[PDB]
Design a protein around this ligand. Structure first.
Ligand code: MG
Ligand code: MG
Ligand code: MG
Ligand code: MG
Ligand code: MG
Ligand code: MG
Ligand code: MG
Ligand code: MG
Ligand code: MG
Ligand code: MG
Ligand code: MG
Ligand code: MG
Ligand code: MG
Ligand code: MG
Ligand code: ZN
Lengths: 97, 99, 135, 113, 57, 220, 108
RNA sequence: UGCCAGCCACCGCGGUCAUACGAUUAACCCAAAUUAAUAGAUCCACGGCGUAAAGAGUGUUUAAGAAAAAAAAUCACAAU
């Protein structure tokens, strides 16, 4: 009969979950600009999660997409297409200090 | 008589809710040269560094404005049973008891 | 001597019983006082075992419906413009006022959130508090 | 060990008189300076280590200081810091820190070592 | 005995103690029991405790 | 002989004899912040009963239980003081060191707030002196050492048949302590509160002792 | 004067000392009790065995258990107890049946 | 006597001062028997299986068994 006790409700102050930069985006092997965004400019490397900062599924998605874009040849392997070097940079790498 | 549960339900520490980005009022009870130890009343004191603006204005007994980050500093670490306490809370300095 | 075994049982046990065996010829002070007013649980030694598998704790988290409102308040305005004091036992924040207004507009029988929330906001506007209105 | 200090200081004075009367000086103005000359002439030890040479001195310089009785006859200890095992140290510490605290509330190369 | 979950029924004492003896007419006895149901529950126990008493005697 | 037995056994028949009921409240403990614990992460497993519940990750003691416990603790403390026996406060906690000595010195009680030499209570006669009396009651204002293990003195008091009255915190282990008080050890309002309370219980026991001695002297 | 002591196990124990080569210690495990139900045991160790007998004596008075006896002879009820690779089992007898035990346990 | 002659059921004893050999001297224990040998009675595991002896390279089924309720959801994607 104690009406001042606590309630067994869920947490109202719960913070909304964070989102990969692509969460519910659509990764296609067709936009090479997008895939260029996640590749090292000098190498043609594919950045890891710890750089790109993507969900699991979106990393995997991006990777496969890239490889497809390479064999089908919309995108080259060993360097970032120069056209796209001047575009917005997503990743956390600092090369030049 | 008040039941404890009632005292809890109506307290400010409850009313505040989550600790992040709260605007709090606090008091300086101890000083080392650059460092000012501030009880905002929560459990543990936080620590601050005396700002460049009006250095000598902040003294023992002074009251202060705080932006409370975390009610206390804790984390669990590799191969630990219990998490590790700093015995302080994380806060930032805004202005001094702006009146 | 006596019994130094910290695991065996409570000090009460050991002491009472060693006297019972007439080894300890002098009844100690705290002993008699203890007999008079014993504590809730005997001070007996327990290994602090870890929990495995499916075992969780018995603690009940602490929440009120007031909080389900406050969530929305902080969702709109943020922490109150008046700041806070944990020294002052009676302190009411912007938040708490909002909760009260909302409780009274709940006793006014309005089930729609928009009406409850906004009109409570109008009550606090009439009280001269500054509602920042952050998206 | 205190009974030893009482006794020893008594016999020290009686032997002091006894020294003056044989050495033929006024027992009043007799100094340690005179004590030394006296024994040095009576028991002339050539010895290199100077502590092993004969001594008659006031027992206080002879014997080490003692730690006094630390508890009443009830078993109950006088100083409140006794259970620290160094009371002597931590008393200095308590006092020093107290001095400091009071200074903080109040305040709002001579060859010295 | 240690193994078994109701080891008391692998005793000799538990065997002698069960009391049913059968008339001279009984030859065969057929227990048909069921695994799953609440209404089976008793029957099962009978198999698990009493059947080994019966037989012994 | 008779009347001494009278003087010692008389106070046991009265649950209130030192009248400590009025020395605090649940409101009092509430403004001394006692109801705050550590994060639920750092909680000990043996506090699970004494707790009330988790408010957004921070654990909260049950103040009703705090009062029930503390009452019994203070009562105990008092009945020992009246019976003229040693009381040793202990804490390692630095913030409060001064307080606890300053408290204890004023009670005619002893503190040990310092590094705690190892064989101290266990090997007494070697450490302290040729023969010695040991604390009748040990009272912890923190149950820990600055390395966050249980203070030796707990194991040791418990080892020596000394009773123990101390403030457990959400992380601390209560189980070897004779009379616990669940409550916040960390906030200075709380330390101060507990200090002055044990202080007062002591003082009242001592006064009442003196009084009943004077009455004993008139009756003779 | 009420406490009897018995030596349970005397054993020659060795160590490796850079200086001395082997180094020989003696360790005795000893029990004490008054017959009235309180008893205990301790270990003690020293270079000279005499010394060690002494050591175990004194240390053993420091750990006493009270052992509760039914009608002042038997135990109360049967005890089956596994302790570290050793199993102990003991049945509660009636009066004419004296002490049937491992020689150590008889002594204790 | 001196790693020799020899002894021991197991551990072991004899390499110069052997209470272990051979012989004295005292003792011990059995005793019309006493030792030695060889067969028995007795003696494993209702204990175990990461490091000790022991979970088979893998799955399915037969034979044989064991059974309250819940017990197919999806690839974060590299079976074949
Ligand atoms: Mg030869
Ligand atoms: Mg010879
Ligand atoms: Mg032989
Ligand atoms: Mg021979
Ligand atoms: Mg024959
Ligand atoms: Mg067997
Ligand atoms: Mg295992
Ligand atoms: Mg193997
Ligand atoms: Mg084999
Ligand atoms: Mg396998
Ligand atoms: Mg197979
Ligand atoms: Mg193989
Ligand atoms: Mg089948
Ligand atoms: Mg099953
Ligand atoms: Zn995502």
């Amino acid at each position: 009969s104690n009406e001042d006790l606590p309630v067994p409700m869920e947490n109202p102050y719960k913070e909304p979950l964070k989102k990969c930069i692509l969460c519910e985006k659509h990764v296609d092997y067709k936009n090479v600009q997008l895939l260029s965004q996640f590749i090292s400019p000098f190498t043609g490397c594919i950045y890891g999660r710890h750089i790109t900062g993507l969900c699991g599924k979106k990393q995997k998605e991006i990777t496969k997409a890239i490889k497809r874009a390479q064999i089908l040849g919309f995108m080259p392997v060993t360097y970032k297409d120069p056209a796209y070097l001047k575009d917005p940079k997503v990743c956390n790498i600092k090369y030049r200090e | 008589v008040e039941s404890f549960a009632s005292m809890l339900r109506h307290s400010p520490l409850t009313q505040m809710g989550p600790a992040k980005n709260k605007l709090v009022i606090g008091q300086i009870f101890h000083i080392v040269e650059d460092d000012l130890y501030i009880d905002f009343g929560g459990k543990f004191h936080c620590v601050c560094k005396r700002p460049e603006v009006d250095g000598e204005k902040y003294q023992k007994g002074t009251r202060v404005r705080l932006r409370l980050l975390d009610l206390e500093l804790t984390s669990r670490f590799l191969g630990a049973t219990t998490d590790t306490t700093i015995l302080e809370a994380d806060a930032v300095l805004l202005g001094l008891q702006e009146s | 001597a006596g019994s130094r075994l910290e695991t065996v049982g409570s000090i009460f046990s050991r002491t009472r019983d060693l006297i019972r065996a007439g080894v300890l010829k002098e009844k100690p002070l705290w002993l008699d006082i203890y007999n008079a007013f014993p504590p809730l649980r005997e001070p007996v030694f327990r290994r602090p075992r870890l929990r495995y598998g499916k075992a969780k704790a018995a603690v009940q988290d602490i929440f009120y419906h007031e909080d389900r409102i406050r969530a929305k308040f902080y969702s709109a305005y943020g922490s109150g413009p008046k700041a806070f004091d944990l020294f002052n036992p009676n302190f009411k924040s912007t938040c708490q006022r909002f909760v009260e207004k909302y409780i009274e507009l709940q006793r006014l029988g309005e089930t729609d959130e928009e009406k409850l929330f906004v009109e409570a906001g109008k009550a606090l506007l009439a009280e001269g508090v500054t509602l920042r209105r952050v998206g | 060990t205190v009974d030893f200090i009482k006794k020893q200081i008594e016999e020290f004075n009686i032997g002091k008189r006894h020294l003056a009367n044989m050495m033929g000086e006024d027992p009043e103005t007799f100094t340690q300076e005179d004590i030394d000359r006296a024994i040095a002439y009576l028991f002339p030890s050539g010895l290199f280590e100077k502590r092993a040479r004969p001594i008659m001195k006031h027992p206080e310089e002879i014997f080490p200081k003692q730690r006094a009785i630390q508890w009443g006859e009830d078993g109950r200890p006088f100083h409140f810091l006794f259970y620290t095992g160094k009371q002597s140290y931590y008393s200095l510490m308590h006092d020093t820190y107290g001095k400091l605290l009071d200074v903080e509330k109040h305040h709002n190369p001579i060859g010295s070592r | 005995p240690m193994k078994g979950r109701f080891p008391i029924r692998r005793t000799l004492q538990y065997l002698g103690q069960g009391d049913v003896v059968f008339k001279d007419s009984v030859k065969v006895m057929t227990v048909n029991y069921n695994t799953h149901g609440e209404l089976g529950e008793g029957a099962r126990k009978f198999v698990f405790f009493n059947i080994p008493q019966i037989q012994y005697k | 002989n008779d009347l001494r037995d009278r003087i010692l056994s008389e106070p046991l028949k009265h649950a209130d004899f030192f009248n400590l009921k009025e020395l605090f409240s649940v409101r009092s403990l509430f403004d001394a912040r006692v109801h705050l614990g550590h994060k639920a992460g750092c909680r000990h497993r043996f506090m699970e009963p004494y707790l009330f519940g988790s408010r957004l990750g921070q654990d909260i003691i049950d103040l009703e239980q705090t009062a029930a416990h503390l009452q019994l603790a203070l009562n105990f403390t008092a009945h020992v003081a009246y019976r003229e026996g040693i009381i040793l406060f202990v804490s390692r906690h630095r913030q409060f060191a001064h307080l606890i000595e300053t408290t204890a010195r004023d009670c005619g009680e002893y503190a040990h707030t310092r590094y705690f030499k190892g064989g101290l209570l266990t090997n007494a006669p070697l450490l302290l002196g040729p023969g010695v009396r040991l604390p009748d009651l040990i009272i912890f204002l923190h149950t820990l050492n600055n390395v966050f293990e249980p203070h030796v003195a707990v194991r040791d008091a418990a080892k020596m048949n000394i009773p123990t009255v101390g403030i457990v915190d959400t992380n601390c282990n209560p189980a070897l302590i004779t009379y616990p008080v669940p409550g916040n050890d960390d906030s200075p309002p709380a330390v101060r509160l507990f200090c002055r309370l044990f202080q007062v219980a002591i003082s009242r026991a001592k006064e009442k002792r003196r009084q009943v001695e004077a009455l004993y002297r008139l009756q003779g | 004067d009420d406490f009897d002591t018995r030596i349970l196990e005397v054993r020659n124990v060795f160590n490796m000392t850079a200086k001395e080569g082997r180094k020989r210690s003696v360790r005795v495990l000893v029990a004490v009790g008054n017959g009235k139900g309180a008893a205990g045991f301790a270990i003690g160790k020293a270079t000279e065995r005499a010394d060690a007998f002494r050591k175990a004596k004194n240390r053993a008075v420091h750990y006493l258990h009270y052992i509760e006896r039914y009608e002042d002879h038997t135990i109360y009820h049967d005890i089956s107890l596994k302790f570290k690779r050793t199993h102990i089992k003991m049945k509660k007898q009636p009066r004419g049946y004296g002490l049937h035990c491992h020689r150590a346990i008889m002594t204790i």
